[PDB]
Design a protein around this nucleic acid. Structure first.
Lengths: 74, 74, 74
DNA sequence: CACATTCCGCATCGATCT
DNA sequence: AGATCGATGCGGAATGTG
DNA sequence: CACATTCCGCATCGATCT
DNA sequence: AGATCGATGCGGAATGTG
DNA sequence: CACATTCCGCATCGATCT
DNA sequence: AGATCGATGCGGAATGTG
């Protein structure tokens, strides 16, 4: 009941969320050359480049799904 | 003569401005699938995801045009 | 031995670094219309839109190459 | 519940084939 | 060499599970 | 003036047509 | 089924307007 | 060393040419 | 008018250089 898992990462995550395609969007353009990334895969790499923590694109696949279940409570 | 319309939104707006294609640019790639957005439409959605306020892509079409008329004063 | 060259710019630069394609990436899509930009060229324009300083895409070509030589020390 | 972990269309992408 | 078709890999939905 | 609101090329995109 | 042509929708310029 | 400055494939892009 | 081929211009590697 304390410091296992972060709330500065939550701000970083939310920065990313906002940066990219806010309430969507662009789908999956890994269609150019020989390494291009997906939406969640970016946000992940953003958080590793803004804290250091490794938080994966499936740790993200999860969280998000979380946050829409919250905006189902009305 | 006080709190009608914001200057934290001005910073958010300017963040967006800088994020996207600084002094331009990329035009209008809503050309992929079945919902992709235009430059100003992004920045708008950025500000709603960073304050909460609804500020539209025409509220932006306006402001900007403002800010180049200022950089006409020399 | 003081204020020649900046460490707030270093944070701005690192913001950009993180924004765009974190540890890469997207190559060089200046392939749309009649003015679209390269990775470093963006980050540069980000820093001029976030401080004011002109720092060029070759001032960047340099720095970076710096920062991987550091992550060669192990 | 806050989580991780199978699913499900997709959409490319390297190898047979008129 | 150009269409054809199994890789493989993503995001997001649907599920485990502690 | 700081604003909102028509314009203007564009550039896709769903429906007739050799 | 593939070119052809009105939708529709954006950003940015040119205008209202309080 | 922290720097700027040639290189090197690339990959578009405006002008000759079946 | 569509392929063909020198522009030109980027990022990143390899070098100057103070």
């Amino acid at each position: 009941a304390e410091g296992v898992w972060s709330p500065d990462i939550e701000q970083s995550f939310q920065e990313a969320l906002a940066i990219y395609p806010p309430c969507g969007r662009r789908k999956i353009i890994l269609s150019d050359e020989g390494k291009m990334y997906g939406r969640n895969e970016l946000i992940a790499r953003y958080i590793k480049l803004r804290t250091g923590k490794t938080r994966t694109r499936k740790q993200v696949s999860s969280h998000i799904q979380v946050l829409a279940r919250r905006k189902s409570r009305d």
